[PDB]
Structure 1
Amino acid sequence: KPMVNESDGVTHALYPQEARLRNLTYSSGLFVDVKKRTYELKYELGKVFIGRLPIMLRSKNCYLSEATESDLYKLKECP
């Protein structure tokens, strides 16, 4: 889901309003199951972060797609 890692090191959830006010980038973290193997010659003997991806608003990854009217009024986003 969309998140923000600050300068001190704390990472919390991000909303588009605070994203516009803090001049941040509305993105989400991306991980990949990286598998490693060692062959010795066919003799055979991790969730790594790869980067952030900007998320479009009103999308299945953004928080606002599942929000209702009153919930959008709570998040200070016009319906």
Structure 2
Amino acid sequence: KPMVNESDGVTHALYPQEARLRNLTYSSGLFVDVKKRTYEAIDVPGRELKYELIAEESEDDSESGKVFIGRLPIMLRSKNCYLSEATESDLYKLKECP
């Protein structure tokens, strides 16, 4: 869900009011899993190279495997946005126009 990290490094969820007043950008972050493999073969001239699996780095079992890749803007009232499930009193306390 959309959120912002200030210059102090503190992280707080970003809401449209703060983006409007403070000149921010309504957006969220994208996380992608990455896996790496290393293959080594003996280069014998005149013969095809036969590589074998030696090292495979895959951090799927830890939260460090999610590589941060960038930030994507979010359109209002879409599935991800907080406004999607807000009732009338929710919109008023957050001060939306119904």
Q: Identify the range of structure 1 (33-42 vs 14-23) with the bigger mean alpha-carbon deviation.
A: 33-42
Aligned CA distance change for structure 1 residues 31 and 41 (closer, same or farther; 3 Å): farther
Aligned CA distance change for structure 1 residues 58 and 44 (closer, same or farther; 3 Å): farther
Larger radius of gyration: 2
User: Is the 1:37–1:44 contact (alpha carbons within 8 Å) kept by the matching residues of 2?
Assistant: no
Deviations 1:33-64 (A, max 9, x none): 01111129665542010010010001001100
Q: Identify the range of structure 1 (22-31 vs 40-49) with the bigger mean alpha-carbon deviation.
A: 40-49
Unaligned runs of 5+ residues in structure 2 are 40-47, 54-64
Q: Segments of 4+ in structure 1 off by > 3 A?
A: 40-45
Q: Secondary structure at the match of 1:42?
A: coil
User: Is the 1:30–1:51 contact (alpha carbons within 8 Å) kept by the matching residues of 2?
Assistant: yes
User: Is the 1:2–1:62 contact (alpha carbons within 8 Å) kept by the matching residues of 2?
Assistant: yes
Aligned length: 79
Are 1:12 and 2:12 an aligned pair?
yes
The corresponding residue for 2:37 is 37
Q: Secondary structure at the match of 1:48?
A: strand
Instruction: Tell me the percent identity.
Output: 100
Unaligned runs of 5+ residues in structure 1 are none
Structure 1 Cα separation of the partners of residues 95 and 75 of structure 2: 18
User: Is the 1:31–1:47 contact (alpha carbons within 8 Å) kept by the matching residues of 2?
Assistant: yes
Q: CA RMSD in A?
A: 1.9
Structure 1 Cα separation of the partners of residues 95 and 52 of structure 2: 56
Aligned CA distance change for structure 1 residues 44 and 58 (closer, same or farther; 3 Å): farther
Deviations 1:3-60 (A, max 9, x none): 0011110111011011101110000011100111112966554201001001000100
